[model samples]
Target: GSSGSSGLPSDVTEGKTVFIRNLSFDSEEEALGEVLQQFGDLKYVRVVLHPDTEHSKGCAFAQFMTQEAAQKCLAAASLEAEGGGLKLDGRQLKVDLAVTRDEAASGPSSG
Candidate 1:
């Protein structure tokens, strides 16, 4: 059974922090909460503005209270739009489970 979290000193299975994407360089942080919270209560969120150049690079992150809710979020979100899915004013959101780095999970910070 390779599903046990026992004796393994590796990175534990933590799916709380979720990676978000899609839409554009829009500063829609609170709006995201309205949509994202429907699936889970938001702990904190960040609207990544690439290098602070007055706009973002379409990247984002959100921390959930429970990983279960995040998993639920991922389930409801689909990458390729098929004309019927959760859309932010017809925007897109591909909910992932890892940070935009190699094991560098996002921190509790503000943008």
Candidate 2:
């Protein structure tokens, strides 16, 4: 049998994205990015907002360049047990994994 070595993409499966809750309403993406940089590189940071209202909802999400970085920052921003988490505006930056699911975006391919 002949075997050939193949390379894998650097992209993570679907866990590079992170979720944040209990965030300050006035939180800035820059602020969060700054915090995340200490742990790992980030790709994107968005303050959750309503399309209609277009206002902060005390929640935000971020995308990391790597899964390890994402996990690192996520763990670092955990919900405080005894004051060991990232706090923004005196509010704990509750951290979790965001469900960045990818779908077909439409009906099934019933060909």
Candidate 3:
């Protein structure tokens, strides 16, 4: 966890994705945008929804125009809008570095 003490990376690039969790059931992509828009340039906001039922999974991914934005979001933590001690539908949000699809597929528990 590195205590997340290290500051945001000095080198930033575009197309970085930020992983966020603890979203409320009632929230949607747009609502998520409202929370993350303040940190940096936003590319897209998407909540993980069940492929079968199309219901929210309480987790989301937000793509930023640059790595700087992503790092900013991490530094701010609960201080940023998405995490700024704000509650959405009664649920607090958890944000962090999003793992790549390949990384997820490589997990030991992968089926």
Candidate 4:
């Protein structure tokens, strides 16, 4: 029952992380952090890379300092391409809750 100043739903704010996709090939972690930090304090930003070639996967994970910050970010706006979503290198960003390992193994949620 401990809600922060953002007043986000408990479930949404409980996880402190967001999954991001559709990043441009030339995107960098520092730049990504800069963009996401506008919503609140960010803990880390990682742009996933291919293991074999170390190329950009156009996807990333961003963790906020607090779960409330992460929740506020998602609830703040519609991330659809034409809905005032954040963009990097002119590409609209797609953001969602970061799934846990168990969730990933179970496949996409039916909810």
The TM-scores of all predictions, comma-separated, are 0.66, 0.70, 0.67, 0.69
Put down candidate 2 lDDT per residue, 1-111, tens digits, no spaces. Answer: 899798977853655788888878768888877877787778888877877897778888888888888878765776444445888888888778787667757767875
TM-score-best of 2 and 4 = 2
Worst 10 residues of 4 by lDDT: 75-84
Candidate 1 local lDDT, residue 88? 65
What clash pairs does model 4 have?
A: none
Best by lDDT: 2
**Off by more than 4 A, model 2:** 1-14, 79-83, 102-111
Better of 3 and 4 by TM-score: 4
Candidate 1 deviant stretches above 4 angstroms: 1-15, 79-84, 100-111
Stretches of model 4 off by over 4 angstroms after superposition: 1-14, 76-83, 103-111
Q: Report the error of model 2 at residue 35, Å.
A: 1.6
By TM-score, who's the top model here? Answer: 2
The CA-based lDDT of model 2 is what? Answer: 0.78
- Model 1: weakest 10-residue lDDT segment is 79-88
Give the alpha carbon lDDT tens digit for every residue of 16-43 in model 3.
8888888888888988877788888789
Which tens-of-lDDT digit does each residue in 1-111 have in candidate 1?
568756956664645877777755543778776677888899888777767575765767888888788887787776453442456656777788865456657789798
lDDT leaderboard ranking: 2, 3, 4, 1
